Design a protein around this ligand. Structure first.
Ligand SMILES: Cc1ccc(F)cc1CCCCOc1ccc(C(=O)Nc2cccc3c2O[C@H](C(=O)O)CN3CCCC(=O)O)cc1
Ligand SMILES: CC(C)CCC[C@@H](C)[C@H]1CC[C@H]2[C@@H]3CC=C4C[C@@H](O)CC[C@]4(C)[C@H]3CC[C@]12C
Ligand SMILES: CCCCCCCC/C=C\CCCCCCCC(=O)OC[C@H](O)CO
Ligand SMILES: CCCCCCCC/C=C\CCCCCCCC(=O)OC[C@H](O)CO
Ligand SMILES: CCCCCCCC/C=C\CCCCCCCC(=O)OC[C@H](O)CO
Ligand SMILES: CCCCCCCC/C=C\CCCCCCCC(=O)OC[C@H](O)CO
Ligand SMILES: CCCCCCCC/C=C\CCCCCCCC(=O)OC[C@H](O)CO
Ligand SMILES: CCCCCCCC/C=C\CCCCCCCC(=O)O
Ligand SMILES: CCCCCCCC/C=C\CCCCCCCC(=O)O
Ligand SMILES: CCCCCCCC/C=C\CCCCCCCC(=O)O
Ligand SMILES: CCCCCCCC/C=C\CCCCCCCC(=O)O
Ligand SMILES: CCCCCCCC/C=C\CCCCCCCC(=O)O
Ligand SMILES: CCCCCCCC/C=C\CCCCCCCC(=O)O
Length: 363
């Protein structure tokens, strides 16, 4: 079949591109992660696990490239071929779950921007669960260099066809479609919460500026406005935040009841309210960026690959090439592999003190 001629040129190129790009990206990302910083978070745990998985997988790519560069002749021994298969699939599904967990965590965080020792350890416990389950689910590959007159690895063949037809069925459903479903619900929930919270924040800021413009324009009415604002704040009852705001109000109302000092003190509420707003806004930015990048990764790297893989398995026959479908599969397999060098975009644009650690390293 002519696809083999296509493969022997196509795979070395993309595998080595992914190798070098991924070594640079992941090596630098892991170096940054491990830099000391005053605070740490569970999302750093999940990102670190993802980057380690990707770099381990990337370390296998020069061997696959060698395979194809030798005319599809494997020289590295039977165990190494087994490990090629195992590393490919363990990386793929560990990555999918680490991404899904990361999106879920960002949602749960944006719900509660203000309010633990335990969640750092919990992130490791969860990661360990994911590793155990995926590694145990994949050990089939370790139990199954086959060919004669040449040594062939990485190839679909009759011996394994039925096996993979069954295995696909589970990995398609639990390893791909269920996580993408979880992501789609997460997207819906992120958008809903973000829109509602920012509408509320705009209302809050607008009423504050109205009251402050009233105080700026017109001492008899200053006390009235301050008492109305104090009553509104008490009915709003972040105990320390409310107490700080109320203490601002009480200081202004004292400086009034004692016109220059009180009107000036009125402005101090504005900067504290802007910081209160910014905390929420940062949490929402992070969640939305994460979910968008992750959905794009899924559309590019994983769903086309699983679709074409499934159809390739279902229609496979011993003496037929199907070069066009097979070529499409080869390309989407490349994309799935390339996820391992794509993921540091997420570390850079949605990291947790990532740029802070990076600036520290630069110092
Ligand atoms: C079970 C489970 C559920 C949820 C999870 F999160 C995790 C798991 C554990 C997953 C364990 C692994 O599961 C699998 C593994 C493989 C599969 C599967 O279809 N394989 C498959 C399908 C079609 C072609 C090939 C194929 O693989 C061949 C090869 O590797 O040798 C090479 N080629 C040839 C590629 C083209 C070329 O180069 O000519 C399908 C499933
Ligand atoms: C992963 C892809 C397919 C997601 C696209 C799904 C579409 C249909 C989603 C994305 C954003 C979602 C919307 C987000 C916010 C709201 C406001 C809520 O009060 C009613 C539902 C509504 C209007 C959702 C409807 C469904 C929705 C429009
Ligand atoms: C990334 C770009 C790699 C493209 C490789 C390629 O297209 O090779 C096809 C050629 O026809 C194979 O002999
Ligand atoms: C580190 C990177 C080395 C990447 C090199 C991996 C590719 C192996 C090239 C090779 O030596 O094999 C070519 C083959 O012998 C032709 O006949
Ligand atoms: C929000 C939701 C958006 C994301 C939806 C996520 C997953 C749905 C996947 C549904 C895939 C159903 C395919 C079933 C099928 O085609 O089965 C073929 C054949 O009948 C079997 O042998
Ligand atoms: C490629 C596309 C990435 C697109 C990433 C889009 C990131 C947008 C995040 C954002 O702008 O935040 C919106 C929110 O309303 C502010 O709080
Ligand atoms: C990884 C990115 C895969 C690049 C896809 C482009 C490609 O494979 O082009 C095939 C070429 O046209 C052969 O006919
Ligand atoms: C073949 C190449 C495979 C990739 C190897 C890349 C090097 C491995 C790890 C690089 C990051 C090392 C982390 C050092 C952290 C320093 C510290 O602990 O402060
Ligand atoms: C990804 C390519 C193939 C790799 C096979 C599996 C390799 C596992 C390597 C690193 C996983 C690190 C495990 C740390 C999580 C355990 C944490 C804990 O138990 O508290
Ligand atoms: C999670 C989404 C629910 C998935 C439910 C049904 C889809 C699974 C059916 C497609 C697998 C058939 C592939 C095959 O024939 O091997
Ligand atoms: C796969 C089968 C899917 C079955 C579950 C389907 C929908 C459940 C969605 C749960 C959303 C509840 C979370 C909202 C919230 O956190 O307030
Ligand atoms: C992969 C994404 C699929 C596309 C889904 C399309 C639905 C988009 C709908 C709403 C997105 C709203 C973006 C946020 C606007 C914020 C403006 C504001 O809050 O003031
Ligand atoms: C392709 C290379 C880069 C584009 C990747 C997506 C960039 C997302 C940036 C999001 C943001 O600016 O907050």
């Amino acid at each position: 079949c002519t696809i083999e001629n296509f493969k022997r040129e196509f795979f070395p190129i993309v595998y080595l591109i992914i190798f070098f790009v991924g070594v640079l990206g992941n090596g630098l990302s892991i170096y940054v992660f491990l830099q000391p910083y005053k605070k740490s978070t569970s999302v750093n745990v999940f990102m670190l696990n993802l980057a380690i998985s990707n770099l381990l997988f990337i370390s296998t790519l020069p061997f696959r490239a060698d395979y194809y560069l030798r005319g599809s002749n494997w020289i590295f021994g039977d165990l190494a071929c087994r490990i090629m298969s195992y590393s490919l699939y363990v990386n793929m599904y560990s990555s999918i779950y680490f991404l899904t967990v990361l999106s879920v965590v960002r949602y749960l965080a944006m719900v509660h921007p203000f309010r633990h020792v335990t969640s750092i350890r919990s992130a490791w416990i969860l990661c360990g669960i994911i590793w155990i389950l995926i590694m145990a689910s994949s050990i089939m590959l370790l139990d199954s260099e086959q060919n004669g007159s040449v040594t062939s690895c990485l190839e679909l063949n009759l011996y394994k066809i039925a096996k993979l037809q069954t295995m696909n069925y589970i990995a398609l459903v639990v390893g791909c479609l269920l996580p993408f479903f979880t992501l789609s619900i997460c997207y819906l929930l992120i958008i809903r919460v973000l829109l509602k919270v920012e509408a509320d924040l705009e209302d809050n800021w607008e009423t504050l500026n109205d009251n402050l413009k009233v105080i700026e324009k017109a001492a008899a009415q200053v006390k009235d406005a301050l008492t109305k604002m104090r009553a509104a704040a008490l009915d709003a009852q972040m105990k320390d935040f409310r107490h700080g705001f109320d203490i601002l109000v009480g200081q202004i109302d004292d400086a009034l009841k004692l016109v220059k000092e009180a009107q000036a003190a009125a402005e101090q509420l504005k900067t504290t309210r802007n910081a209160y707003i910014q905390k929420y806004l940062v949490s929402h930015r992070k969640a939305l960026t994460t979910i968008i990048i992750t959905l794009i990764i899924f559309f590019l790297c994983f769903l086309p690959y699983h679709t074409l893989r499934t159809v390739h398995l279902t229609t496979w026959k011993v003496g037929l090439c199907k070069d066009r479908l097979h070529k499409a599969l080869v390309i989407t397999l490349a994309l799935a592999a390339a996820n391992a060098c794509f993921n540091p975009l997420l570390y850079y644009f949605a990291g947790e003190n990532f740029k802070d650690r990076l600036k520290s390293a630069l110092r």
